[PDB]
Amino acid sequence: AAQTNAPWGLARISSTSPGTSTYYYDESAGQGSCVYVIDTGIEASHPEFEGRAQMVKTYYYSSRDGNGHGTHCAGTVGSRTYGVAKKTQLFGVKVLDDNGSGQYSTIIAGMDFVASDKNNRNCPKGVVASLSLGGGYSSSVNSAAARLQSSGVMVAVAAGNNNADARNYSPASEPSVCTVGASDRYDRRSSFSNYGSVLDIFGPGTSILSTWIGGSTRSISGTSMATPHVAGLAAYLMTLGKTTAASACRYIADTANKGDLSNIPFGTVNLLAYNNYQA
Numbered sequence: 576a577a578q579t580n581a582p583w584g585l586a587r588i589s590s591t592s593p594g595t596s597t598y599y600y601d602e603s604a605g606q607g608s609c610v611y612v613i614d615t616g617i618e619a620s621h622p623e624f625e626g627r628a629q630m631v632k633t634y635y636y637s638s639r640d641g642n643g644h645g646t647h648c649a650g651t652v653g654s655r656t657y658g659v660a661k662k663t664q665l666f667g668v669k670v671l672d673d674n675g676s677g678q679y680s681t682i683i684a685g686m687d688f689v690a691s692d693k694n695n696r697n698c699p700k701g702v703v704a705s706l707s708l709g710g711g712y713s714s715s716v717n718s719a720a721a722r723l724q725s726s727g728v729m730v731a732v733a734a735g736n737n738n739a740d741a742r743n744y745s746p747a748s749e750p751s752v753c754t755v756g757a758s759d760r761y762d763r764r765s766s767f768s769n770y771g772s773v774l775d776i777f778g779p780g781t782s783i784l785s786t787w788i789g790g791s792t793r794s795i796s797g798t799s800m801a802t803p804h805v806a807g808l809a810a811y812l813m814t815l816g817k818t819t820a821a822s823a824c825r826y827i828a829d830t831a832n833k834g835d836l837s838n839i840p841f842g843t844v845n846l847l848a849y850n851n852y853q854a
């Protein structure tokens with residue numbers, strides 16, 4: 576399949592080189608997989624999700640997204656226009672309030688919820704979670720991310736936007752989940768992106784157009800935008816039978832565009848997520 580005039584990030588993820596604007600992907604499109612977005616929730620009624628999004632959990636007075644952030648991420652994973660996996664099922668877990676904040680304890684409870692809740696969902700092709708959130712190092716938070724992963728969910732988490740070493744951040748510093756840095760459309764590291772030996776991969780994170788609340792769209796930036804590219808790419812590859820939750824991050828790093836990014840600090844990976852689709 577070919578989506579012309581795609582958002583740049585989508586075109587990039589299916590290209591060996593920057594500067595193109597068509598997104599190419601197998602038409603299976605992540606059908607039969609599931610992605611959890613653990614964030615400020617999802618405006619499920621957005622036309623762009625076409626019935627494939629649902630809220631399954633909130634820790635606050637409402638499950639609606641009063642912020643927009645989680646809706647944006649969700650649209651990058653799986654909306655028809657702005658998403659990588661255009662046919663995946665989307666599950667929203669609201670651990671952050673409408674100011675985009677959440678206590679560590681709620682975030683942890685949210686991760687354990689998904690690790691049980693995937694047993695209540697239909698996802699023959701596999702299960703992914705996109706965690707675009709971040710805070711100072713906590714072994715409790717890391718540990719929660721490690722359980723989510725070990726239960727059989729491909730876990731992808733934002734490196735963080737501090738332009739610093741991600742070792743000091745959770746769940747970014749957890750070794751067993753996929754930590755995701757942000758790149759821009761000229762193949763440079765995003766200026767806010769964290770870096771470090773703990774990163775596994777880079778996705779598109781600067782000027783990323785996707786869904787927003789009130790049924791609209793906007794462009795915004797962050798490792799939180801890059802993360803759903805990788806989360807959607809895993810779901811897509813899993814429905815293709817190419818990989819599993821347990822080895823997805825590894826597979827994505829093996830098949831990445833290598834050595835193509837600029838401003839990558841010595842000792843951080845120079846890997847850019849890539850779907851290897853032969854159209």
Ligand SMILES: [Ca+2]
Nearest residue numbers: 749750752754
């Ligand atoms: Ca990691």
